[PDB]
Symmetry: D2
Amino acid sequence: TGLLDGKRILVSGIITDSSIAFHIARVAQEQGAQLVLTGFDRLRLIQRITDRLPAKAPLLELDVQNEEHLASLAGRVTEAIGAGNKLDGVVHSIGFMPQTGMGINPFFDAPYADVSKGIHISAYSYASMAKALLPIMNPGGSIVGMDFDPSRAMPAYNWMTVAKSALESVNRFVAREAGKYGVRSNLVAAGPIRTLAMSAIVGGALGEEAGAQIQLLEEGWDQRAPIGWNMKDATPVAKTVCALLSDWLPATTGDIIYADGGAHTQLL
Amino acid sequence: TGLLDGKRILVSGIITDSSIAFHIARVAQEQGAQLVLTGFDRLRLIQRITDRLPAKAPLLELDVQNEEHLASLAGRVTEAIGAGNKLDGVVHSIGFMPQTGMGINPFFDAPYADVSKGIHISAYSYASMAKALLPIMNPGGSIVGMDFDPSRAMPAYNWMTVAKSALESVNRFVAREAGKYGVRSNLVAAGPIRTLAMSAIVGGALGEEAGAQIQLLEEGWDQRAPIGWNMKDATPVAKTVCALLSDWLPATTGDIIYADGGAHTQLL
Amino acid sequence: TGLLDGKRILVSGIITDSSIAFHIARVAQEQGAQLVLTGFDRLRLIQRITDRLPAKAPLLELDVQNEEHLASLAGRVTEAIGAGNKLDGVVHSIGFMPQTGMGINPFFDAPYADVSKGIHISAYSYASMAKALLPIMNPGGSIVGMDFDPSRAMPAYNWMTVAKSALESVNRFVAREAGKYGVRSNLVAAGPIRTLAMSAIVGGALGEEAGAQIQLLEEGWDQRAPIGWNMKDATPVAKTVCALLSDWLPATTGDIIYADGGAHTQLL
Amino acid sequence: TGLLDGKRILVSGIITDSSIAFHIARVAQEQGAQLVLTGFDRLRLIQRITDRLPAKAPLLELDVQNEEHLASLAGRVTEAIGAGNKLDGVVHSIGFMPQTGMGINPFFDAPYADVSKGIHISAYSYASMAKALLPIMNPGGSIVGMDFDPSRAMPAYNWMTVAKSALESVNRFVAREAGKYGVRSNLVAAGPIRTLAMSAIVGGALGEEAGAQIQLLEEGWDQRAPIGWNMKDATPVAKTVCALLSDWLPATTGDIIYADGGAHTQLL
Ligand SMILES: NC(=O)c1ccc[n+]([C@@H]2O[C@H](COP(=O)([O-])OP(=O)(O)OC[C@H]3O[C@@H](n4cnc5c(N)ncnc54)[C@H](O)[C@@H]3O)[C@@H](O)[C@H]2O)c1
Ligand SMILES: NC(=O)c1ccc[n+]([C@@H]2O[C@H](COP(=O)([O-])OP(=O)(O)OC[C@H]3O[C@@H](n4cnc5c(N)ncnc54)[C@H](O)[C@@H]3O)[C@@H](O)[C@H]2O)c1
Ligand SMILES: NC(=O)c1ccc[n+]([C@@H]2O[C@H](COP(=O)([O-])OP(=O)(O)OC[C@H]3O[C@@H](n4cnc5c(N)ncnc54)[C@H](O)[C@@H]3O)[C@@H](O)[C@H]2O)c1
Ligand SMILES: NC(=O)c1ccc[n+]([C@@H]2O[C@H](COP(=O)([O-])OP(=O)(O)OC[C@H]3O[C@@H](n4cnc5c(N)ncnc54)[C@H](O)[C@@H]3O)[C@@H](O)[C@H]2O)c1
Ligand SMILES: CCCCCCCCCCCCCCCC(=O)SCCNC(C)=O
Ligand SMILES: CCCCCCCCCCCCCCCC(=O)SCCNC(C)=O
């Protein structure tokens, strides 16, 4: 038993055991929830990884860009959980953006073909996923997607910041749409965690200039954060997503709950 | 056992069983926390009311405006809980403002002697209380005070809005101050609940004009709210304060967690 | 002479004499600025309309979605103004969204092909335009695009809100990009103005089901607005865009200046 | 010509040629605005200070913490300008707060007295000069006092950022109980210019701690602004205030006009 006792919670976005999505699943499982895991394309590969999760959770295939995947979604999920049973949650830990609009390549240069590829998988997909799953959700259910404070412009995040900013706005509209089924829609704003990707830029893969600009940024995050910030530990972020998936915040919708050590409230 | 199992949580602001503070205590108690209740002046009276709380919690006297009360605070509390034991939380459900700056009397007329009386008990007291108690708080502890979205100017709330706006800012500074002890500082923003006071204005005690301006406001709160808003039930607000008092949001500080049905994110 | 004396200011987005862009041009011209007008496709038609502008301003063709148009942009403009002379401003009054995005279309239905068509012309084009023109701008120059407060979710705007929200974020990044040339980037947030089919969004073609929606919106806007709101007059918005184009706000960048009667600051 | 050639304005708050006001005033006094100034506890001081200014304007011994003073804050200016000849501007730059809630003296090391005592000029104040000068004001005309971004918790500024979150909230209600007057009350928030308060809170009377902290935040703002920021001068910031008096920013209220240099909007 536990925080997520008896709840059937869906969790997408696991590609490795460093994924925030992997930690959300691990913690969600410990807390008692029953998971239905979805994976992009490396099905036999990420399968192996989902084997690390304390409990077995049926892996289903889901490319958010494909309406064939979306359509089948609710359907498979039902077979995944059972007939009669419905979903208590949906976790959208999906975020993409080709190097063209994120990082060392300039802001003005990133072409729309890529920007749009990020805005479709990062921002929009939240909607289409709320769209495909909402019907099979019990009232009182919760849908929570990841965010990264787009309020102020920062170097490198460039177009991925813009796609996240669009994400928050979408959150609000899905919120009233989810309202009709009793579901809540919320977004979590974490500080940088070191997934494969971040370890990459850190160690000069991007190079000197970049690896530093981001180093200091991660560095400063700890400066301002009152209870500090531990970028090599996602457990604080997993815990937060689980709380939002519980009966303890039954009134927050179209909202954003920050889990970045409060770094965003301090200036220095 | 439960959400607040084994935690010793302080809860001030109970004057009746309609007080949000009363609900925070009732739920906190059910969830397993051990309470230490503080009361303003009607000690023998509010005592009788705290008797309704599922469990007995030692009532201590606390007038936030009195430095004698503040100084003794930590002290008594220790006797209240025991030698060795420390506090896991502090709940500041205190808010005051003489009718001069709130309601039907105009904004320009409210004199500073009153405005200041509200700003001392509503805004500042959060600090002095964090001041008096912080020392006896275990790291990982949480301090949460009530708020009422001051972002946009609304009729009647007038100077009490201003004092709450000052409150949020104080929250941020106490946040970094609490950081050094491992405590988190957060503010909850609820929509209108009907305590004694609100039932009063509603039923024309203030009169026609006022009783209506507030009626429609409470009315519209439900309009915009996606999962609606039940002003005759504080259970949703109590639940939220308890979650903030738990291990499930270990990274939010100097923050504000809205519990108003998300009415604040929608325009219509 | 006047507010925009001697300044060569570009103004895009004029399709009729109801366009806010038309008013920005009329006032800009009165104030002394020299205009370089751009039109989408109805070149012979909107040409006829630009003839109403107090003074003649060379019409150039510009489809923002076409990199051929963009590339040629700086070039033509130079021939339009002269050799040696540079631009002092750029006004991006461009905004698009097919009825499946906005409309009364259930938000979940709007497919990405359209959403993306709006996000390319509304949000992104701001960038590519700042991209194409920045080079020929004098330091101290100003680029200002239109906005419509996306902070809170409102009915009908749906995906166009999302595109506008993306727009503000882009503004911030163009802001630091423009910084290097001395140019400022800012967005103006107006309340509803009535433009010919926008009179078919209320008491015309689009106000029968969720059509009164833009009534109580067009209505409520005046309620909350302290100095009121006159939706049948764009002069207040034109005046604001000209001030931003002047030497009187030399330090605001990546910012948003609201021109909706302050309706956005009041709750009721 | 001028923005203000012909506009009648009271500019409140001159102590030095180096403090904000002496700036707004020469700039305002040069733009055709005929002004009437206010001074504090050494008017014999602000007197010969003022000769340094561009033309003549009388000095009224005020102090918005004195009520016989507030009492007469209309029919003394009405005596100062014309025999029933009206007034256009209220450029409030009245603000102050004692060194215990300052930086040097720690957040918790201070009491109410002093905070309450500073708000009176800092926060509350704007909600004073308002009522007084109001029915002696002409439509159009504005009420505008300085703001220093309260949003993030600026350590070292402490209570005079909290008072700042409060000046703001109070300027929004004056945005309504003035909007009937067709008057504007709008806040111009700007960055830490080197004035006698700051120029001295470094060179000698505070030794360090708030100091390193302040220079800590000055290297910042500069390094963080797209169009950059200088602090050895206030002129672009003084200008941004002016057009906020003119007819060029016509549709805003209970608003914040930012001339900080785009520093409030840049993460890194
Ligand atoms: N790591 C950080 O610093 C950090 C911090 C806060 C928030 N975030 C955000 O959280 C999200 C997850 O990133 P992460 O680093 O925690 O984990 P991750 O990158 O390991 O997980 C992201 C997932 O995106 C998915 N994806 C991409 N395109 C897809 C598509 N077409 N269809 C279906 N799935 C697709 C992949 O399956 C992948 O598992 C992103 O939105 C990211 O911006 C990251
Ligand atoms: N009721 C609502 O509509 C509503 C909604 C959201 C937030 N709030 C806020 O929550 C807080 C509590 O109000 P409520 O209606 O839930 O309950 P309440 O009014 O019943 O409780 C408020 C408490 O203020 C305390 N108090 C006043 N001065 C004091 C002082 N000098 N020293 C010590 N204690 C003092 C009293 O002891 C009283 O118990 C206020 O800040 C209020 O603005 C109210
Ligand atoms: N009317 C209102 O209620 C209102 C209020 C505030 C802000 N706004 C915003 O201001 C902008 C202008 O709308 P409006 O009603 O004032 O005027 P409008 O609709 O008359 O002008 C908009 C322009 O969009 C242009 N456009 C579309 N696609 C283009 C493309 N592919 N390439 C180049 N140009 C293209 C057209 O040329 C057209 O002139 C929009 O962003 C709108 O959302 C509208
Ligand atoms: N310099 C900075 O750090 C900076 C920069 C931007 C914004 N802010 C804010 O800008 C505003 C302008 O400050 P300045 O830097 O020109 O300061 P200054 O102190 O040199 O001049 C402004 C005035 O503060 C006044 N003041 C104190 N009590 C007052 C009272 N009771 N009556 C009348 N005036 C009162 C004095 O009369 C003094 O003349 C302040 O409110 C400041 O908080 C500060
Ligand atoms: C190769 C990764 C690109 C480098 C990181 C992008 C620029 C970093 C600066 C902004 C910091 C923002 C924190 C966000 C980090 C991310 O979104 S990681 C990308 C998500 N998933 C992967 C592995 O691609
Ligand atoms: C007698 C109460 C005064 C009337 C209510 C104030 C004006 C209501 C309009 C704004 C609505 C805001 C909701 C907030 C309500 C409160 O803070 S109730 C006062 C707190 N405690 C008491 C009983 O005095």
